[PDB]
Structures are given as C-alpha cells and as structure tokens.
Amino acid sequence: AKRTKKVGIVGKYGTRYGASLRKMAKKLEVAQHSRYTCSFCGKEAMKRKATGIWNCAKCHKVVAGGAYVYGTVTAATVRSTIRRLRDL
Amino acid sequence: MREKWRKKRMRRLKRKRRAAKK
Amino acid sequence: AENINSRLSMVMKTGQYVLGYKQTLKSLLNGKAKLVIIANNTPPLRKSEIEYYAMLAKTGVHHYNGNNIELGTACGRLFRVCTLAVTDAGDSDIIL
Amino acid sequence: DPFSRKEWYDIKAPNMFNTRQVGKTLINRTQGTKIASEGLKGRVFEVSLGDLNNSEADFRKFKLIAEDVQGKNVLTNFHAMSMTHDKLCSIVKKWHTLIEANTAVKTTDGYTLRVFVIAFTKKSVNQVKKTSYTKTSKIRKIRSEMIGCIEKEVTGCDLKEVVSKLIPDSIGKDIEKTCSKLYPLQEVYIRKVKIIKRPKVDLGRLHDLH
Amino acid sequence: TFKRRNHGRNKKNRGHVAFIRCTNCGRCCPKDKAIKKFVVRNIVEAAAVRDIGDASAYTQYALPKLYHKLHYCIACAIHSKVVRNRSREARRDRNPPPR
Amino acid sequence: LGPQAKEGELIFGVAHIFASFNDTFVHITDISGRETIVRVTGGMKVKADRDESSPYAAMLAAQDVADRCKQLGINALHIKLRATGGTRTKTPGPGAQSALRALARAGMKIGRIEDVTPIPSDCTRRKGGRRGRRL
Amino acid sequence: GRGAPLAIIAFRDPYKYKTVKTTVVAAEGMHTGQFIHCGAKAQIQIGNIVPVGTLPEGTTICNVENKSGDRGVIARASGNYATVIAHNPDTKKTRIRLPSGAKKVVQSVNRAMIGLVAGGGRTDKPLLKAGRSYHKYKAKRNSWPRVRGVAMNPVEHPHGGGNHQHIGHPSTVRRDASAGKKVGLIAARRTGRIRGGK
RNA sequence: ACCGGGGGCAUUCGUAUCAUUACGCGAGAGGUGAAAUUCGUGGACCGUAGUGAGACGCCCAACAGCGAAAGCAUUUGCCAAGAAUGUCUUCAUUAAUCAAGAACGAAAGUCAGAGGUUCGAAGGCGAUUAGAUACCGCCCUAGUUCUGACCGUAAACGAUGCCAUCUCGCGAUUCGGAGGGUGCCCUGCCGAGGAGCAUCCGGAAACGAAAGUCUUUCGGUUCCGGGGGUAGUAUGGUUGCAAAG
RNA sequence: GACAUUGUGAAGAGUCAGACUCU
C-alpha cells in the first residue's frame, strides 16, 4: 500500500526543514538514488557511488556524471554540438 | 470595465474575509 | 533500415537463427552462419572478434542501427541480444 | 577656418568599371603621428553603376574600399554591392509569390561572398487567374535551383570575374532562363552581395587591378 | 445587434491572426481588421518635380518613387478620414470607391 | 579651399536630409560620408521648438548649406532622404521637400535621390502600449 | 573537499621504460577505459586536452590554462566551464568567457580540456541539516560555524557592542582600510538587491 | 516532381533597437497642442565603417492554407503524425453521442535556473487641471525571452454542441483527380474544403442555405435555462505554493 | 611623486644650438 501520499523518500526528515525545502530535496534525492540505463552494456545498473561518480554493476564501468543525475542537460548539449561539428 | 471592477472588488472582499476567518 | 527489421521478423517467424555470442561463434566455426547481425553498442573487442571470425568464414556482418535492447526487440525477445547469426533465411530475403 | 587643414584626394575605382573616376574626398593634412594616407586607408565609398559604367542599370550600387594611396589618388577595390530601395519596393508586388535565397560561395582568390538573390513568380501570356502563386514544394525546388546556379556561376572564378558578371547582372538573366522550368520566374536580380571572409591585402594584385 | 456579417474582420478558416501596430496611434490591431492602403507617390511633390528636373545633373534622370504600406486601426483611420461611415445599405458595398 | 575643377566638372557632395516630424537635418558630407562639409538644422534657424520641422526652417537651413557648399566649391549633391524609421514612422517629415527644393533653387545640381529610411526585417516592440497613444 | 571527481590517467614515458600517472578533474562523460589524447594534433572530443587556438567559436572547455604551461587553472569547480568566444590569428590570441561572466584574452597555445567539469548541479540540494555543513567543512578547512560580528563585543569586532545589536557605522568600507578594520562590504560599488541584469 | 505559417529538435540568414569603438562636425538634440523633466562643448544629436547583446521574422501576406481547440510565417537538415484525392486492395458493423474519468488549453500570474535588447504594470518625476493618485512626455522595477514545473481561466465568439439526411441559382477561390489544347488556357467536368451575391421557407425582428424541411410538433445523442437582484455571495466539500479554480 | 637600480633602437612634438626634453 502507498505509505506516504506525497512526501515519498523525503519522509525520513519527518516534519523538519520546511515543506518547500523538503520538496526541493525530494527531486534530487530520487534522482540520485535511482538506477540508470548504462550506455555501454545497456542494462539498468548505473548507481551513484559518490557525487559525480557512477558505477555500472554489470560491466564495472565508472563514469563521470552529474552530482544527482547520471547525465546533465548541459553535457548532453555539448556532446550534441561536438557530434554535429564532427559530422559537418 | 464595469462588472470586471465589481469582480475585483468582490475578490478583494473575499481575500479580506479569508484573512479574518483564518 | 526499416526493411532489415521486416526481414529479421520474417527470419524469426520462418528461418533458423542463434541468438547470442557463444552460439554465434560456434555457428561461425562450424560454417552454417549465413549472416551475422551485431548490435551497435557491443564491446569493441567483441566487435573485432566477430568481424575476424566472419572474415575467416566468408560471411556477411551487418551492424544493426541500434543497441542490444533494440536488437532484442527486433528479434521479438524480452531480453537483450548483442549478437545473432541467421543460419537459414527461410522465407525471407535477408541474405540478399 | 577649420577647412584650411583639409587636403582633397581623388577616388579611383578598379578597372572593372569603365569610368575610373569616382569623385573627390578629403581629409585633415598629416599632423604629428596622424598620416593622411593611413587615415584614408579603410574608407568606404558608395557609387552607382550609372556613375561607373553609364549603363541603364542605375539602381545597382557598389561599395569600394580604399586599400592604398599613391600621391593624391585613393585606389579602391570592390567591397559590397546592393540594389536600391526604390527598385526593391517597385519590384515587390501583391498576388505574386516572392522567392528569396542567399548563399555563401567561395572564389578562387580567397574571398567568401554571401550573395542574396530575389525573384518573383511571373504571369503567363494568356492568364486569366489573378494570382500567380505556386506550391511551396516548387518554391523549395526553385530556391535550391537558384542556389545551385549561383554556385556553378561563381565557383571557379575570382573577384574580378564575379564583379564583371555582376556589372550587367548576367547571373540574374541566367537564373530567369534556367530556373523557369518549374514556374516562369520574373524580375530576377542579385539583390545584394557582401564579403564574409577576405584574404590579406595584396598590393601587387591591387596595382594590377589599377 | 450584429452590425456586420463578417464581424468587422476578414478572418475565415482561421483561429488567430497576428496583429500590427497602427502607423498613427501605435495601437495593436489584427492584420485582417486593420485597414491597409498601398501608397505609391513621387519622391518629389508635383510642385517641385519641375525644379528638380531643371536642377538635375544628368541629361535624362528618372525620378524614383516612395512605396508605403500603411496600416491604420479603425479609430485613427476614421479620424484621418481614410474611411467614412456609410448608410446601412451602402455598408454592404465592397467595391473600392473611385479614385 | 576646395578641390580642382576641370573646367566644368561637377564636384559632388552627398546631402543627408533627415526629415522627422520634430526637426530637420540637412547634412553634407563627401562621397565616403566620413567627412562633413557643413550641416544645419531647423532648430538652429528658428527659435520656437514647435517649428523646428517647419518647411521655412528646412528651406533656411538648405539655403545656408548651399551658400557654404558654393563657397567651398561643391556644386552637386547626391540626395539621401531619411525619416525616423526603425519602429517609428516611415514617411519623411514636412521639411524634406522644402530642403530639397531649396537646394535646387539655390543652384546645386541634383544627382541621384534615394530614400534610406531604416526598415527592419522585424522590429522590437513599438513605443506606445497595446492601446496606442490615446491623444 | 572537492565537489568534482578526479580522473587518474596513465601515460607512457617517451624517454624511458615507465608509466606516468596524471590527476585532473574529470569532464562529464569521461569513463574508465577511455583514451584521452593530449597535444596540438588531438581531435575535438570530450576529455581531449588541446590548445584553445584550434577550437571553433562557442566551444565549451574546462581546465583552461591561464598562462601557457601552468597546467590548467581555470574552470575547475564541478559543473563549471569556459567558452571560446573569438580568435585573432595575427596576434595568435583567443578571447574566452570565464564562468563568472568575465572575458579574458589568452595565448592561442594555452591548453584546455574539451567539455565541462563533472559533478554539476551539486549546489541545488539544500544542506537541510547543520551537521551536513559541519561535515562539508570538516573536509575543507576551519571556516564554520560563522559568528555574526554584531553578536560580539567591541573588543573583537568593529560591529560589536551596543545595547542593541546594530552595526552603528556603514558596512561599506574602503579598499585601503587597515587589516583590523576591513570588515563588511569591501570597496562595494553598490548595495541592496540587484534589480535588473548584472 | 503529393499538400499544408500542422508539431518537435538542431541550424542559417536578415535589417532594425540598444550599447559601444574609430573618425568629422560643430551647438544644439529630444519631446509636445504648447512646453517642461531629460541629454549635450567631458563635445551630444547627426554622418561613414565596424563590434557585442537580446528580441523579432517587415514587405510577399490574401473573405489564402494547416491544426481538436488554444494557435502556426526567415533558410536548411532530421524525427514522428495527418487531411483530401485515386483505388475492381483488406476486415466485416468493429459505429454516433457520451455521467465518472483523462490529455491539451491565449494572456496574465506563481516556483527554480539562465538571460537580460526593446517595451513596460507598480514606482518616481515634467506637464494639463479646480484637483489629476489619469489621459500626454521622461527614467524605470516585476514582467515581456529560453529551460523545467504549477494555474486551468478569456468577448477561449460563429455569443450558434456533435453525428446522419433532404431542399437553388450564379460565378469566382485552395487541394487532388479525369478529358483535351498550347507553366498557362478550355470541359455549364468529379470530389473535398473556405467563402460571396439568387434565395424556398423560418424568425419578434435584426437577420439565417441554415437559425429552413415544427401546432403538418415526433432521425440519434450530450450539456444547459425557468422574471430581475441578493450572487457566483455565505457555508460545506474539493484542487492549488499562492493568486484563485 | 621624485631620485637610483635603468640598459639598446625608432617615430612625433617642443626647446635650443649636434644636443636635451617629453609622448
């Protein structure tokens, strides 16, 4: 059964630090504790080791990514720009 | 700009009523 | 592109195939692998090994336009396939 | 009198134009570290092809940039070309589709020129229908054809030859005669041409040009 | 009461039409609704064409023209008399008036 | 003072005539446009601000400029008509025609006349509100 | 003490039988087993270390060399980067944009790593607890907790003292103030909330 | 050689606005009904050539097109989707409308991060006025722009729900097709749109080829109204960070 | 700010009568 209506993972903080701060922390906590699909082996086994470091449980590759997300929008855009310049 | 201002007046009154009831 | 998916579906429905690296290597060694389809995210060393085996066996290698997830989906499986070998095209024109 | 310090120089257009005398400019006479020649080098003058070649195509304008000064002569070279606002406004008509194109094309000398071309749909001889529109796919094809024709015409030659071709606007008529296979085009002109990238000044080539 | 069958605009088969800024007042008016006029005039007034011609530096010089597409909102157009109020019957007349 | 005339050659300056609805500039430069021979504005000739753009002010400025040009040896003028442009009115003000005719009457030869009002491919938002100037 | 991960990279010594290991802040996307090419002829790829003169305008770089040979000094915090604004071949120089918005001119031979620094977005999660800040500064240095000057006595701070907790004097102090007086907004050009761009 | 400002993501170009650099000028410039606030000899405004930022895509542009609506317009590349038309292709009733339920949904507004050119609520001045917390002018803050989330309201209008069918004439218009002639023309040519003026009947009328085929009422179906206010208010419920729905 | 450390060349202006001063 759904134990918490809206607080979710941030329920560890109880009634502290303010609703807005807890809401802002919820997104990043979920992102940093989620599993991501590894671009190398293709399996959803990428997990955060430390801030910026992501380990693949299967292929054992260590990637430098975001603090709380596997990849960042700015990094994606930079990669796209480099690829486009390579193509043309 | 005649009934729209009545709406604005009523909204102000409702805001005051909310503040008072709170 | 869109044609290879249809040919692969026809091969799965009617043809004969082996899904996976080890079976692909065995089929290449014993010379019944008509074609070898290989995903785009396969490890580079494995890619080179498959290509070397194919060059030895005089068989075609097709670099699928997708990762192992998409290759498995094309094969119609709910798991990931990073390599496969078609040994009998069946009622399909995959080889040509 | 503040005008007692000014010396008068004569602008000299390059040899693509018949009338090599453009006009008279002026500048403060050399004083201290300010040299009149160095002050003049870099100026831009707008002239009309009516004043350069005396052809009927008066509406076309040429910008000439001063790169060297000998004596009292300011030798200029092509810097940019543009049509006249009155001509463009007269050209634009209602009930006609306007096709605009622009392309960066490289000369054999080291220049990159951005050429802007404008064209309009033409009414046939025996046409009753008021409007002269066409399918947007046909517009796309016509634009691509114009770009390709510009590339073929310019690429392979150098700045002198391109300026010679612009003087009568041979490219415009070539477009009007080739691209009409899809929809008969009318009133095609090279609306503008500007210099994106240019090579380092070559005084020997400029002298040959003068 | 509905004054006009077209509701004062020229909008059919369309949901939204981008607006223009009136040449005089600057007010925003839908392009279909705003009254447009294309004015082509001699660059020099009729009273000075002769003076400019006699002062011309060329044997034969064609005097250019000014082309202006003016958009007026309804209020400024009526005030400047670009358009006038019409009778109930004459309102339906759509042919441009004689020039 | 001035250039050397080859016994009847037309020495050409360029007169920029910026005729707005608040003032009128007649500004003479060389062909390059980077050197100014002389310039006069209607506000220099009239006292009240309401008539800085009047045809009388425009013609007075044009007469003064023609006198100075004839003094310096310039005898022909390439005209460059201009309005406020940009997001503002595209129509030349009421001083443009007066200045042009005044130059012609003063006796400068008139070369090529062109309108150089700045026209945008598209503009920033205009000055007034969405309801315009209500006065 | 650093918010950006470090990359241990192994190179072969050209002059002897030995391998040399290098420590540098990783660019986002760099992974173990990757090959990083460093030099004037290296291509435009993420993680490569190349002179800034060979990059096109708008290229995103990190670990930029302030002076040729200083081994990377600019844009080293997590998620930060500089941009290649312009070039000047005649003087052999390049204009770049720093993370702070400043524009700086460097020699075209200055090296930089292509890409942005890994670990971006760190300063978006609130440090909800004071213990989090305690642990944060425990790994960096002794700069926390911070006691307000007005809460002190006049013997330890220019703001201290008074029957009310108030500064009493303008907080904006001049640049050349003495060591014990330079507290507050130092050489402040302006104060208050910034309304507009700046 | 389909059609389309339908959608999304990158990308190219364009002048203009502002700022600023270089050079010249010389005292006004700006703005108004008239002025003033304001800018200007530290040389403004005006010229010519650059540079930078952000915004916006003029003219073409239309009783033109596309989209469920809101809405949609610089070039090119890529992605998925679609209408009409053609069809002696396939399935064979699979359909219409829909409580509850769900997606989208202008502008303003809220939250976070970037940007901050222009314009500009609030604010401050100069005017006008009996006053002017306004209209007019000047300087501007939020905002206007992008990214990711909220709100779910507009005269969100055709003030006309959707599906099917019948009733008139004319000539134009967008798309596709058929047949002829030389991209254009012709066929009282065929469908699908979007309209216009000859219009039976209808309507209190204005007017409507639908708002007609209704006391000769009755094709199917959803929502809504019951003299004007109190009042979209109070209270209760529910959604929302708030504003509020 | 001045003097010393402080050397070697160009261009401009100003002082002089080949020098000095500045930029």
Side-chain angles (χ1 to χ4, degrees):
Chain A
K2 213 172 61 157
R3 294 178 290 255
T4 58
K5 145 163 200 204
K6 85 208 318 173
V7 159
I9 184 176
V10 137
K12 52 162 139 184
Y13 299 136
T15 88
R16 280 164 260 136
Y17 318 121
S20 100
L21 287 196
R22 279 194 273 101
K23 178 150 159 271
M24 168 182 351
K26 205 219 172 168
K27 162 152 66 103
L28 304 176
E29 298 253 12
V30 169
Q32 79 174 91
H33 294 123
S34 302
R35 272 190 180 111
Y36 293 89
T37 168
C38 180
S39 34
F40 303 93
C41 55
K43 152 164 190 182
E44 187 131 322
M46 263 287 175
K47 238 175 167 45
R48 192 169 144 279
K49 149 97 182 131
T51 181
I53 321 185
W54 296 80
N55 267 268
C56 187
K58 170 159 205 327
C59 60
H60 306 299
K61 278 248 164 32
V62 189
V63 181
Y68 315 117
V69 289
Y70 174 56
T72 62
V73 181
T74 323
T77 75
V78 171
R79 238 158 32 220
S80 286
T81 297
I82 270 51
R83 200 217 326 91
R84 190 177 56 75
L85 263 51
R86 179 153 254 91
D87 294 335
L88 79 95
Chain B
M1 308 317 78
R2 167 69 267 200
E3 265 286 347
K4 165 198 267 209
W5 303 152
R6 290 182 39 72
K7 279 190 54 152
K8 205 174 173 82
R9 193 188 264 208
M10 196 57 83
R11 264 150 202 242
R12 270 193 263 251
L13 201 54
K14 262 200 308 294
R15 226 186 296 216
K16 274 318 109 193
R17 289 207 245 258
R18 273 181 249 145
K21 223 160 159 281
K22 279 156 66 87
Chain C
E2 191 33 83
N3 223 30
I4 169 72
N5 270 10
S6 325
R7 284 129 173 251
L8 200 50
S9 91
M10 281 303 312
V11 168
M12 308 267 115
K13 260 119 55 173
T14 83
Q16 297 276 117
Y17 53 93
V18 292
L19 307 173
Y21 173 73
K22 295 233 275 166
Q23 297 199 252
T24 298
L25 255 51
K26 302 214 200 92
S27 85
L28 263 156
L29 275 177
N30 62 28
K32 33 214 280 193
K34 303 324 168 34
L35 175 85
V36 168
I37 313 180
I38 184 191
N40 76 351
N41 87 277
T42 178
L45 185 68
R46 194 167 281 166
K47 221 184 50 78
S48 274
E49 212 200 353
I50 294 328
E51 280 164 8
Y52 203 82
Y53 273 62
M55 157 219 80
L56 283 182
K58 322 270 217 322
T59 165
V61 181
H62 179 261
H63 299 92
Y64 192 76
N65 187 22
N67 56 355
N68 42 6
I69 310 178
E70 292 164 86
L71 187 41
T73 307
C75 293
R77 301 294 190 294
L78 293 176
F79 48 87
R80 300 181 300 273
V81 182
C82 213
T83 307
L84 62 107
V86 322
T87 65
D88 162 7
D91 286 331
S92 104
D93 39 57
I94 187 96
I95 264 49
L96 286 316
Chain D
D1 187 325
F3 230 84
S4 62
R5 320 177 290 179
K6 331 300 267 208
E7 333 188 37
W8 289 83
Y9 288 69
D10 276 78
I11 308 110
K12 294 286 172 205
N15 44 349
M16 313 75 137
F17 313 115
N18 306 354
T19 299
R20 208 169 136 281
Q21 173 60 13
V22 168
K24 301 236 197 198
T25 192
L26 65 157
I27 186 161
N28 282 2
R29 82 178 62 269
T30 166
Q31 159 108 336
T33 35
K34 322 215 64 158
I35 317 307
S37 315
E38 305 300 319
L40 287 158
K41 294 159 145 273
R43 306 254 272 242
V44 184
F45 320 84
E46 198 163 22
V47 200
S48 179
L49 208 54
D51 282 89
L52 280 166
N53 276 36
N54 317 349
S55 83
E56 292 300 81
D58 176 357
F59 50 79
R60 215 163 303 99
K61 298 174 311 201
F62 278 89
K63 271 163 170 209
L64 322 167
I65 183 176
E67 331 200 38
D68 183 53
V69 185
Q70 318 237 327
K72 292 312 211 69
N73 294 342
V74 190
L75 299 324
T76 43
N77 192 14
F78 173 83
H79 185 66
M81 193 233 90
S82 34
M83 274 195 25
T84 271
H85 187 234
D86 326 293
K87 187 63 163 123
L88 291 159
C89 285
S90 47
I91 272 183
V92 178
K93 297 312 222 325
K94 228 173 141 165
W95 317 126
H96 292 265
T97 285
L98 168 160
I99 308 106
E100 250 171 353
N102 93 72
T103 171
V105 48
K106 215 173 312 193
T107 60
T108 57
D109 163 347
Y111 287 86
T112 55
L113 305 161
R114 190 147 245 127
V115 164
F116 304 82
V117 193
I118 180 167
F120 278 74
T121 53
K122 194 198 200 83
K123 261 188 142 200
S124 295
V125 199
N126 330 108
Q127 173 168 336
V128 186
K129 153 189 286 317
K130 151 159 84 50
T131 71
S132 147
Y133 307 136
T134 175
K135 319 305 180 44
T136 287
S137 46
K138 232 175 288 297
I139 294 308
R140 227 85 59 63
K141 254 175 271 301
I142 277 168
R143 188 181 277 131
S144 212
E145 278 255 327
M146 272 174 3
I147 301 266
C149 186
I150 277 281
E151 299 260 356
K152 155 262 184 72
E153 178 119 17
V154 173
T155 280
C157 77
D158 78 352
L159 204 78
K160 285 205 56 142
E161 315 198 48
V162 286
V163 174
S164 327
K165 285 137 93 92
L166 301 167
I167 280 157
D169 209 40
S170 60
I171 317 187
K173 35 212 77 171
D174 307 328
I175 299 282
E176 211 185 31
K177 160 265 288 163
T178 55
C179 297
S180 269
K181 306 308 95 155
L182 288 158
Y183 203 102
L185 291 195
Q186 137 197 299
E187 194 111 9
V188 183
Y189 294 106
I190 301 293
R191 178 175 82 70
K192 187 193 284 223
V193 75
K194 61 175 47 164
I195 303 203
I196 291 331
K197 188 153 164 24
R198 76 202 280 305
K200 187 93 39 172
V201 80
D202 196 337
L203 304 104
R205 172 185 307 281
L206 175 81
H207 283 168
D208 310 1
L209 193 70
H210 280 270
Chain E
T1 311
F2 300 90
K3 200 153 156 165
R4 314 185 160 75
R5 161 160 251 253
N6 70 348
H7 309 305
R9 345 179 54 182
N10 205 6
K11 185 186 76 79
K12 307 264 188 307
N13 193 227
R14 213 144 304 103
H16 180 244
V17 168
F19 63 68
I20 53 83
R21 320 292 310 269
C22 170
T23 194
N24 186 334
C25 8
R27 149 178 271 260
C28 297
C29 191
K31 197 174 171 183
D32 41 283
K33 196 199 228 266
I35 77 98
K36 285 157 233 66
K37 72 163 334 182
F38 184 52
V39 160
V40 163
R41 94 209 308 210
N42 256 320
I43 175 49
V44 195
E45 36 177 359
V49 317
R50 193 249 200 70
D51 272 359
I52 299 308
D54 308 24
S56 211
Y58 306 125
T59 56
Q60 165 60 36
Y61 179 57
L63 231 47
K65 316 190 100 33
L66 298 156
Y67 313 75
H68 291 305
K69 181 98 174 280
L70 308 186
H71 316 259
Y72 297 76
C73 83
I74 276 74
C76 285
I78 297 162
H79 185 71
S80 300
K81 299 150 174 280
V82 186
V83 309
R84 263 161 191 101
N85 72 42
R86 264 116 62 86
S87 325
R88 186 155 247 281
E89 295 44 41
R91 265 188 221 133
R92 325 201 39 250
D93 172 358
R94 214 178 171 81
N95 296 123
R99 70 187 334 170
Chain F
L1 294 188
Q4 320 298 300
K6 296 341 175 63
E7 286 66 32
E9 70 164 341
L10 281 201
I11 307 270
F12 266 94
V14 50
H16 314 267
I17 310 189
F18 172 18
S20 73
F21 283 95
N22 266 321
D23 197 32
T24 169
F25 299 67
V26 311
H27 183 176
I28 278 55
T29 54
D30 54 311
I31 301 304
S32 96
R34 216 187 271 250
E35 290 277 337
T36 87
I37 315 314
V38 60
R39 58 170 266 209
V40 188
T41 70
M44 284 168 54
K45 305 317 302 221
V46 312
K47 221 103 66 195
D49 309 24
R50 53 181 318 162
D51 42 37
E52 297 155 312
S53 42
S54 69
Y56 193 56
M59 147 189 95
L60 290 176
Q63 294 176 348
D64 284 25
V65 154
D67 155 17
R68 185 77 172 111
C69 285
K70 275 199 280 300
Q71 228 171 78
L72 279 169
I74 320 276
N75 43 5
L77 287 174
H78 289 304
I79 308 295
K80 302 280 216 44
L81 259 281
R82 185 223 206 266
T84 319
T87 52
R88 242 80 64 71
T89 42
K90 300 315 175 300
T91 88
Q97 279 321 279
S98 211
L100 206 47
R101 169 206 263 288
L103 293 170
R105 298 273 317 136
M108 327 290 291
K109 327 311 277 194
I110 305 300
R112 322 223 173 255
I113 303 126
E114 151 161 46
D115 180 335
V116 289
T117 304
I119 306 311
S121 319
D122 224 17
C123 43
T124 57
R125 173 163 198 95
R126 228 199 99 157
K127 169 148 156 19
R130 99 174 318 266
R131 290 199 289 152
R133 215 169 150 271
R134 315 180 277 292
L135 232 258
Chain G
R2 190 191 305 264
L6 288 179
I8 317 300
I9 307 136
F11 294 90
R12 263 208 325 137
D13 196 313
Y15 314 93
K16 50 182 293 215
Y17 177 52
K18 178 157 262 281
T19 93
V20 201
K21 309 270 217 43
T22 283
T23 321
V24 67
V25 290
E28 207 164 311
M30 278 195 0
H31 56 97
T32 50
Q34 172 184 39
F35 280 120
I36 290 331
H37 319 262
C38 299
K41 300 286 201 54
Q43 288 145 25
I44 320 291
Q45 334 194 41
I46 300 287
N48 273 18
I49 292 163
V50 309
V52 288
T54 78
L55 307 166
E57 287 64 355
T59 313
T60 288
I61 60 192
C62 60
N63 265 109
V64 183
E65 255 185 353
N66 164 51
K67 295 255 172 273
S68 182
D70 78 20
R71 308 179 66 175
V73 107
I74 278 149
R76 291 201 320 208
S78 49
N80 268 264
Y81 59 88
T83 302
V84 181
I85 276 167
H87 296 273
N88 185 339
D90 254 8
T91 53
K92 301 158 104 92
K93 262 142 177 34
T94 81
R95 207 130 181 281
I96 57 159
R97 219 197 85 114
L98 306 171
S100 65
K103 278 150 270 310
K104 150 176 263 299
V105 179
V106 288
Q107 281 192 315
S108 280
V109 287
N110 282 9
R111 298 176 290 156
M113 169 175 306
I114 294 148
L116 76 164
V117 187
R122 176 164 44 69
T123 62
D124 287 354
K125 210 221 270 180
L127 288 156
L128 297 146
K129 308 150 53 161
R132 250 55 181 290
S133 158
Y134 162 87
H135 290 296
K136 158 173 214 202
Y137 283 103
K138 183 90 163 15
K140 299 168 155 303
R141 77 205 63 84
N142 179 345
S143 294
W144 185 91
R146 331 187 217 255
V147 178
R148 284 167 306 109
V150 288
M152 298 189 196
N153 285 302
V155 68
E156 317 107 353
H157 208 277
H159 300 183
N163 287 352
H164 290 292
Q165 267 198 19
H166 75 301
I167 308 196
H169 309 110
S171 284
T172 48
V173 295
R174 50 185 218 291
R175 165 68 76 210
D176 55 292
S178 316
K181 214 257 182 300
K182 220 193 294 205
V183 286
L185 327 182
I186 314 304
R189 301 181 194 81
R190 53 157 318 279
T191 44
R193 42 189 132 72
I194 303 168
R195 298 241 155 271
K198 198 86 227 73

